[PDB]
Amino acid sequence: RMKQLEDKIEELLSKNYHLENEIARLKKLVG
């Protein structure tokens, strides 16, 4: 079960990084 949690953390981290990239993209579009 420990491996599952560790996989979820790495998964959520990658997702969060993508959302930050999306924010940077959308902010770049603003103007």
Added chain:
Amino acid sequence: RMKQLEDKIEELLSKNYHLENEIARLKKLVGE
């Protein structure tokens, strides 16, 4: 160790939802 990993998930999930809320507002402004 269980608790540490579980707290990290709850932390990252909370940040995730705040990022999604911000993206939703930005898409409206830009017209996406």
